Amino acid sequence: STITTHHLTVPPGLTPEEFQELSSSIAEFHSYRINPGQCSSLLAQRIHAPVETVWTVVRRFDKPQTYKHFIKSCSVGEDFRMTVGSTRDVTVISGLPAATSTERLDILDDDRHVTGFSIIGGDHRLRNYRSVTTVHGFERDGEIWTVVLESYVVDVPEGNTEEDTRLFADTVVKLNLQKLASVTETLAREA
Amino acid sequence: STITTHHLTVPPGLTPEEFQELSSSIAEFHSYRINPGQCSSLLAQRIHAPVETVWTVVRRFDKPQTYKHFIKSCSVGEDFRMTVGSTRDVTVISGLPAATSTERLDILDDDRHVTGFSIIGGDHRLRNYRSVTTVHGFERDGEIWTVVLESYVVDVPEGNTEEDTRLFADTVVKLNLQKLASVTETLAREA
Ligand SMILES: O=C(O)c1cccnc1
Ligand SMILES: O=C(O)c1cccnc1
Ligand SMILES: O=C(O)c1cccnc1
Ligand SMILES: O=C(O)c1cccnc1
């Protein structure tokens, strides 16, 4: 069993200068104790939009389709409120038949701009997948931008390599972070 | 058995004016005879780059990773030449374990800017999938842009709805057309 080292390595998508400003946040929110047979990754996406514009989208646990690809539908409770412990039933059209992903809201901090979720059921999902997303505001000479960090820990399926597990999960997260950046940059350019 | 109607409907991503200029091309290259249990779709993507810049990328049958997502690797023959009938073995990391997709080059027309392929083997692939991609140059008041059309026909898996089959395939094609547009627009902005 070891502690992940995401705070010691510049993630793809981030400059070293930005990283040095985020060291304590990555230590606090994007560190995991991982066992053999588990892997973990940290991904970053720069967004030319204000933090609260990005956070308003990121934080909608009931509307993953607004920032993620391959979401056919998402159902929550009749009296769903945005509280830790809530679940969502996502139908993912990344293959046929569409898969069910039952996901738990693990963290929601509107002050610190932190959220995260765990896959707790469904079919054809990653085993023991948990992720955390944080949103960070940057300024330089009056210019403003945002950095989104997203990390996960996941079990490596027996019969699969850690290399492929990481390649799959990284590709999904990165593509969704790119959708997040497009959606929020459009809102920023337009509103 | 019917003939598809893609030439009578403006596809998503295309203006009616552009469509009226492409009617004969869609009839020629993007029409299929479909049987019950089959479905077909036409997708469009506008690209702010010259046709030959787009075609140079689109036409590389041996390098799908340059315009498509979730491609872990692509292997061709030792003396692979870009000829109809050639095959490629693509490793697709859209899930675990990665899938093998064996694909046949069906069409390659460098004059008309037409290509297409068929899935002829592998695992966890669509059954009877065939697609055709065409690239078209547009001009207006000196300004130049490109339109890429991509259509497919595919079998609807027994147990799946045509709605979900079309949603899956459309999402993949559209996302890859978006990567094509980013890659070629970057080349255009830079070269
Ligand atoms: O199987 C594929 O080709 C595929 C599945 C999901 C996402 N992208 C590609
Ligand atoms: O965030 C997701 O939904 C996700 C991320 C990685 C892999 N599979 C799903
Ligand atoms: O299973 C998923 O969440 C998934 C798989 C491929 C592509 N996008 C998402
Ligand atoms: O072009 C592809 O590789 C493709 C398109 C739709 C569905 N699956 C794969």
PDB file of C-alpha atoms in Angstrom, chain B:
ATOM      1  CA  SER B   1     -36.080  -3.228 -48.240  1.00  0.00           C
ATOM      2  CA  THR B   2     -35.855   0.549 -48.858  1.00  0.00           C
ATOM      3  CA  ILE B   3     -33.401   3.173 -50.067  1.00  0.00           C
ATOM      4  CA  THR B   4     -32.093   5.613 -47.486  1.00  0.00           C
ATOM      5  CA  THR B   5     -33.274   9.223 -47.644  1.00  0.00           C
ATOM      6  CA  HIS B   6     -30.185  11.121 -46.479  1.00  0.00           C
ATOM      7  CA  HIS B   7     -30.315  13.316 -49.604  1.00  0.00           C
ATOM      8  CA  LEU B   8     -33.803  14.601 -48.663  1.00  0.00           C
ATOM      9  CA  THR B   9     -33.008  15.748 -45.091  1.00  0.00           C
ATOM     10  CA  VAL B  10     -30.590  18.416 -43.886  1.00  0.00           C
ATOM     11  CA  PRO B  11     -28.166  16.514 -41.631  1.00  0.00           C
ATOM     12  CA  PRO B  12     -27.168  17.852 -38.225  1.00  0.00           C
ATOM     13  CA  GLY B  13     -24.165  20.152 -38.635  1.00  0.00           C
ATOM     14  CA  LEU B  14     -25.029  21.519 -42.088  1.00  0.00           C
ATOM     15  CA  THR B  15     -26.926  24.509 -43.370  1.00  0.00           C
ATOM     16  CA  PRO B  16     -29.729  24.101 -45.914  1.00  0.00           C
ATOM     17  CA  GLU B  17     -27.738  26.166 -48.425  1.00  0.00           C
ATOM     18  CA  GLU B  18     -24.725  23.879 -48.040  1.00  0.00           C
ATOM     19  CA  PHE B  19     -27.026  20.862 -48.278  1.00  0.00           C
ATOM     20  CA  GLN B  20     -28.481  22.016 -51.613  1.00  0.00           C
ATOM     21  CA  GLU B  21     -24.947  22.147 -53.035  1.00  0.00           C
ATOM     22  CA  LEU B  22     -24.261  18.608 -51.773  1.00  0.00           C
ATOM     23  CA  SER B  23     -27.480  16.882 -52.876  1.00  0.00           C
ATOM     24  CA  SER B  24     -25.910  14.976 -55.777  1.00  0.00           C
ATOM     25  CA  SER B  25     -22.883  13.925 -53.706  1.00  0.00           C
ATOM     26  CA  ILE B  26     -25.099  12.583 -50.928  1.00  0.00           C
ATOM     27  CA  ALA B  27     -27.167  10.693 -53.493  1.00  0.00           C
ATOM     28  CA  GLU B  28     -24.044   9.247 -55.114  1.00  0.00           C
ATOM     29  CA  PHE B  29     -21.944   8.306 -52.075  1.00  0.00           C
ATOM     30  CA  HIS B  30     -24.217   8.388 -49.002  1.00  0.00           C
ATOM     31  CA  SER B  31     -27.196   6.278 -50.083  1.00  0.00           C
ATOM     32  CA  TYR B  32     -27.809   2.673 -49.062  1.00  0.00           C
ATOM     33  CA  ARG B  33     -30.382  -0.033 -49.583  1.00  0.00           C
ATOM     34  CA  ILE B  34     -31.370  -0.977 -46.035  1.00  0.00           C
ATOM     35  CA  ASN B  35     -33.281  -4.022 -44.873  1.00  0.00           C
ATOM     36  CA  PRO B  36     -35.508  -4.288 -41.812  1.00  0.00           C
ATOM     37  CA  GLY B  37     -33.213  -4.682 -38.855  1.00  0.00           C
ATOM     38  CA  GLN B  38     -30.726  -2.194 -40.306  1.00  0.00           C
ATOM     39  CA  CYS B  39     -30.309   1.525 -39.769  1.00  0.00           C
ATOM     40  CA  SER B  40     -28.361   4.305 -41.387  1.00  0.00           C
ATOM     41  CA  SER B  41     -27.352   7.855 -40.607  1.00  0.00           C
ATOM     42  CA  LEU B  42     -25.630  10.837 -42.176  1.00  0.00           C
ATOM     43  CA  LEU B  43     -23.524  13.291 -40.138  1.00  0.00           C
ATOM     44  CA  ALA B  44     -21.827  16.524 -41.224  1.00  0.00           C
ATOM     45  CA  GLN B  45     -19.000  18.657 -39.837  1.00  0.00           C
ATOM     46  CA  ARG B  46     -17.956  22.098 -41.064  1.00  0.00           C
ATOM     47  CA  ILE B  47     -14.190  22.763 -40.943  1.00  0.00           C
ATOM     48  CA  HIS B  48     -12.465  26.112 -41.378  1.00  0.00           C
ATOM     49  CA  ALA B  49      -9.592  24.678 -43.403  1.00  0.00           C
ATOM     50  CA  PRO B  50      -8.982  23.981 -47.120  1.00  0.00           C
ATOM     51  CA  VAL B  51     -10.225  20.705 -48.583  1.00  0.00           C
ATOM     52  CA  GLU B  52      -6.784  19.321 -49.318  1.00  0.00           C
ATOM     53  CA  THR B  53      -5.678  19.949 -45.737  1.00  0.00           C
ATOM     54  CA  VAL B  54      -8.671  17.957 -44.490  1.00  0.00           C
ATOM     55  CA  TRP B  55      -8.333  15.240 -47.129  1.00  0.00           C
ATOM     56  CA  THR B  56      -4.642  14.705 -46.365  1.00  0.00           C
ATOM     57  CA  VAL B  57      -5.682  13.674 -42.844  1.00  0.00           C
ATOM     58  CA  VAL B  58      -8.984  11.868 -43.664  1.00  0.00           C
ATOM     59  CA  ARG B  59      -7.365   9.685 -46.326  1.00  0.00           C
ATOM     60  CA  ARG B  60      -4.747   8.033 -44.046  1.00  0.00           C
ATOM     61  CA  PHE B  61      -6.309   4.602 -43.581  1.00  0.00           C
ATOM     62  CA  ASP B  62      -3.234   3.439 -41.669  1.00  0.00           C
ATOM     63  CA  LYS B  63      -3.449   6.318 -39.130  1.00  0.00           C
ATOM     64  CA  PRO B  64      -7.004   6.465 -37.746  1.00  0.00           C
ATOM     65  CA  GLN B  65      -5.600   7.642 -34.401  1.00  0.00           C
ATOM     66  CA  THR B  66      -4.873  11.015 -36.003  1.00  0.00           C
ATOM     67  CA  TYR B  67      -8.594  11.769 -36.495  1.00  0.00           C
ATOM     68  CA  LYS B  68     -10.375   9.350 -34.128  1.00  0.00           C
ATOM     69  CA  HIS B  69     -10.710   8.985 -30.362  1.00  0.00           C
ATOM     70  CA  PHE B  70     -10.025   5.886 -28.238  1.00  0.00           C
ATOM     71  CA  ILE B  71      -7.474   4.420 -30.689  1.00  0.00           C
ATOM     72  CA  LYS B  72      -4.751   2.665 -28.714  1.00  0.00           C
ATOM     73  CA  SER B  73      -2.890   1.422 -31.798  1.00  0.00           C
ATOM     74  CA  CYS B  74      -3.314   0.588 -35.480  1.00  0.00           C
ATOM     75  CA  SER B  75      -1.296  -2.065 -37.317  1.00  0.00           C
ATOM     76  CA  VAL B  76      -1.172  -2.539 -41.082  1.00  0.00           C
ATOM     77  CA  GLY B  77       0.822  -4.850 -43.337  1.00  0.00           C
ATOM     78  CA  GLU B  78       4.579  -4.978 -43.813  1.00  0.00           C
ATOM     79  CA  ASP B  79       4.186  -3.723 -47.399  1.00  0.00           C
ATOM     80  CA  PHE B  80       0.896  -1.941 -46.794  1.00  0.00           C
ATOM     81  CA  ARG B  81      -0.078   0.244 -49.708  1.00  0.00           C
ATOM     82  CA  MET B  82      -3.166   2.457 -49.741  1.00  0.00           C
ATOM     83  CA  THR B  83      -5.292   0.248 -51.957  1.00  0.00           C
ATOM     84  CA  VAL B  84      -8.912  -0.821 -51.791  1.00  0.00           C
ATOM     85  CA  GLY B  85      -9.105  -4.223 -50.122  1.00  0.00           C
ATOM     86  CA  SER B  86      -6.344  -3.501 -47.623  1.00  0.00           C
ATOM     87  CA  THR B  87      -7.110  -4.118 -43.966  1.00  0.00           C
ATOM     88  CA  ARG B  88      -6.069  -2.556 -40.695  1.00  0.00           C
ATOM     89  CA  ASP B  89      -6.085  -4.054 -37.207  1.00  0.00           C
ATOM     90  CA  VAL B  90      -7.153  -1.296 -34.803  1.00  0.00           C
ATOM     91  CA  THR B  91      -6.958  -1.655 -31.047  1.00  0.00           C
ATOM     92  CA  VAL B  92      -9.813   0.399 -29.563  1.00  0.00           C
ATOM     93  CA  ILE B  93      -9.556   1.427 -25.913  1.00  0.00           C
ATOM     94  CA  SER B  94     -13.245   2.240 -25.456  1.00  0.00           C
ATOM     95  CA  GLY B  95     -13.499  -0.333 -22.685  1.00  0.00           C
ATOM     96  CA  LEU B  96     -11.550  -3.054 -20.957  1.00  0.00           C
ATOM     97  CA  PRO B  97     -10.006  -5.244 -22.297  1.00  0.00           C
ATOM     98  CA  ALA B  98      -9.270  -3.139 -25.415  1.00  0.00           C
ATOM     99  CA  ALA B  99     -11.151  -4.369 -28.461  1.00  0.00           C
ATOM    100  CA  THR B 100      -9.761  -5.510 -31.793  1.00  0.00           C
ATOM    101  CA  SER B 101     -11.413  -4.007 -34.883  1.00  0.00           C
ATOM    102  CA  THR B 102     -10.400  -5.473 -38.237  1.00  0.00           C
ATOM    103  CA  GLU B 103     -11.413  -3.031 -40.940  1.00  0.00           C
ATOM    104  CA  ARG B 104     -11.378  -3.145 -44.745  1.00  0.00           C
ATOM    105  CA  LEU B 105     -10.638  -0.173 -46.998  1.00  0.00           C
ATOM    106  CA  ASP B 106     -13.660  -0.127 -49.319  1.00  0.00           C
ATOM    107  CA  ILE B 107     -13.141   3.073 -51.277  1.00  0.00           C
ATOM    108  CA  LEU B 108     -10.291   5.472 -51.863  1.00  0.00           C
ATOM    109  CA  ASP B 109     -10.777   8.235 -54.435  1.00  0.00           C
ATOM    110  CA  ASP B 110      -8.181  10.994 -54.212  1.00  0.00           C
ATOM    111  CA  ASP B 111      -9.788  12.965 -57.056  1.00  0.00           C
ATOM    112  CA  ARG B 112     -13.322  13.031 -55.606  1.00  0.00           C
ATOM    113  CA  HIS B 113     -12.150  12.921 -51.947  1.00  0.00           C
ATOM    114  CA  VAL B 114     -14.105   9.776 -51.021  1.00  0.00           C
ATOM    115  CA  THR B 115     -13.137   6.984 -48.656  1.00  0.00           C
ATOM    116  CA  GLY B 116     -14.885   4.330 -46.630  1.00  0.00           C
ATOM    117  CA  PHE B 117     -14.384   1.138 -44.661  1.00  0.00           C
ATOM    118  CA  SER B 118     -16.149  -1.955 -43.358  1.00  0.00           C
ATOM    119  CA  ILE B 119     -15.734  -3.755 -40.032  1.00  0.00           C
ATOM    120  CA  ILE B 120     -14.902  -7.353 -40.988  1.00  0.00           C
ATOM    121  CA  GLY B 121     -13.704  -8.804 -37.709  1.00  0.00           C
ATOM    122  CA  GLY B 122     -12.659  -8.272 -34.151  1.00  0.00           C
ATOM    123  CA  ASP B 123     -14.468  -8.338 -30.841  1.00  0.00           C
ATOM    124  CA  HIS B 124     -17.187  -6.134 -29.361  1.00  0.00           C
ATOM    125  CA  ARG B 125     -17.691  -4.353 -32.680  1.00  0.00           C
ATOM    126  CA  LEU B 126     -20.865  -3.376 -34.492  1.00  0.00           C
ATOM    127  CA  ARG B 127     -22.147  -6.059 -36.871  1.00  0.00           C
ATOM    128  CA  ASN B 128     -22.249  -5.233 -40.587  1.00  0.00           C
ATOM    129  CA  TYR B 129     -20.942  -1.695 -40.032  1.00  0.00           C
ATOM    130  CA  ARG B 130     -19.918   0.176 -43.186  1.00  0.00           C
ATOM    131  CA  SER B 131     -19.168   3.889 -43.497  1.00  0.00           C
ATOM    132  CA  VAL B 132     -18.336   6.394 -46.234  1.00  0.00           C
ATOM    133  CA  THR B 133     -16.638   9.775 -45.742  1.00  0.00           C
ATOM    134  CA  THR B 134     -16.511  12.526 -48.350  1.00  0.00           C
ATOM    135  CA  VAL B 135     -14.815  15.930 -48.209  1.00  0.00           C
ATOM    136  CA  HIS B 136     -16.178  19.022 -49.972  1.00  0.00           C
ATOM    137  CA  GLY B 137     -14.792  22.487 -50.601  1.00  0.00           C
ATOM    138  CA  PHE B 138     -16.930  25.599 -50.294  1.00  0.00           C
ATOM    139  CA  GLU B 139     -16.293  29.201 -51.226  1.00  0.00           C
ATOM    140  CA  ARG B 140     -18.177  32.422 -50.561  1.00  0.00           C
ATOM    141  CA  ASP B 141     -16.837  35.925 -51.303  1.00  0.00           C
ATOM    142  CA  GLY B 142     -13.264  34.628 -51.252  1.00  0.00           C
ATOM    143  CA  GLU B 143     -13.675  32.783 -47.966  1.00  0.00           C
ATOM    144  CA  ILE B 144     -13.013  29.045 -48.043  1.00  0.00           C
ATOM    145  CA  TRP B 145     -14.144  26.215 -45.810  1.00  0.00           C
ATOM    146  CA  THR B 146     -14.697  22.475 -45.923  1.00  0.00           C
ATOM    147  CA  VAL B 147     -17.632  20.180 -45.192  1.00  0.00           C
ATOM    148  CA  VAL B 148     -17.030  16.543 -44.261  1.00  0.00           C
ATOM    149  CA  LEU B 149     -19.939  14.139 -44.667  1.00  0.00           C
ATOM    150  CA  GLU B 150     -19.864  10.738 -42.998  1.00  0.00           C
ATOM    151  CA  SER B 151     -22.612   8.118 -43.282  1.00  0.00           C
ATOM    152  CA  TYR B 152     -22.946   4.530 -42.102  1.00  0.00           C
ATOM    153  CA  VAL B 153     -25.222   1.531 -42.376  1.00  0.00           C
ATOM    154  CA  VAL B 154     -25.272  -1.010 -39.570  1.00  0.00           C
ATOM    155  CA  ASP B 155     -27.215  -3.966 -38.260  1.00  0.00           C
ATOM    156  CA  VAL B 156     -29.381  -3.339 -35.214  1.00  0.00           C
ATOM    157  CA  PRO B 157     -28.269  -5.866 -32.575  1.00  0.00           C
ATOM    158  CA  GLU B 158     -31.042  -8.244 -31.595  1.00  0.00           C
ATOM    159  CA  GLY B 159     -32.204  -7.007 -28.200  1.00  0.00           C
ATOM    160  CA  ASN B 160     -31.319  -3.379 -28.986  1.00  0.00           C
ATOM    161  CA  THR B 161     -33.493  -0.617 -30.376  1.00  0.00           C
ATOM    162  CA  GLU B 162     -32.671   1.249 -33.553  1.00  0.00           C
ATOM    163  CA  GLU B 163     -32.854   4.411 -31.442  1.00  0.00           C
ATOM    164  CA  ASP B 164     -29.948   3.300 -29.232  1.00  0.00           C
ATOM    165  CA  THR B 165     -27.946   1.868 -32.134  1.00  0.00           C
ATOM    166  CA  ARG B 166     -28.213   5.188 -33.966  1.00  0.00           C
ATOM    167  CA  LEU B 167     -27.471   7.166 -30.788  1.00  0.00           C
ATOM    168  CA  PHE B 168     -24.278   5.173 -30.197  1.00  0.00           C
ATOM    169  CA  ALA B 169     -22.931   5.274 -33.748  1.00  0.00           C
ATOM    170  CA  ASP B 170     -23.906   8.927 -34.244  1.00  0.00           C
ATOM    171  CA  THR B 171     -22.161   9.915 -31.051  1.00  0.00           C
ATOM    172  CA  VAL B 172     -18.935   8.176 -32.061  1.00  0.00           C
ATOM    173  CA  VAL B 173     -18.920   9.583 -35.581  1.00  0.00           C
ATOM    174  CA  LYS B 174     -19.775  13.090 -34.411  1.00  0.00           C
ATOM    175  CA  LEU B 175     -17.044  13.085 -31.760  1.00  0.00           C
ATOM    176  CA  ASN B 176     -14.458  11.880 -34.276  1.00  0.00           C
ATOM    177  CA  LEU B 177     -15.600  14.470 -36.832  1.00  0.00           C
ATOM    178  CA  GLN B 178     -15.017  17.035 -34.111  1.00  0.00           C
ATOM    179  CA  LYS B 179     -11.481  15.720 -33.602  1.00  0.00           C
ATOM    180  CA  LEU B 180     -10.959  15.869 -37.364  1.00  0.00           C
ATOM    181  CA  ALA B 181     -12.027  19.521 -37.346  1.00  0.00           C
ATOM    182  CA  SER B 182      -9.732  20.408 -34.446  1.00  0.00           C
ATOM    183  CA  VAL B 183      -6.729  18.619 -35.922  1.00  0.00           C
ATOM    184  CA  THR B 184      -7.132  20.109 -39.374  1.00  0.00           C
ATOM    185  CA  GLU B 185      -8.025  23.610 -38.161  1.00  0.00           C
ATOM    186  CA  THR B 186      -4.843  23.588 -36.083  1.00  0.00           C
ATOM    187  CA  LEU B 187      -2.784  22.579 -39.120  1.00  0.00           C
ATOM    188  CA  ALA B 188      -4.494  25.350 -41.094  1.00  0.00           C
ATOM    189  CA  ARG B 189      -3.946  28.038 -38.431  1.00  0.00           C
ATOM    190  CA  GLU B 190      -0.289  27.025 -38.094  1.00  0.00           C
ATOM    191  CA  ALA B 191       0.877  26.096 -41.605  1.00  0.00           C
TER     192      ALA B 191
END
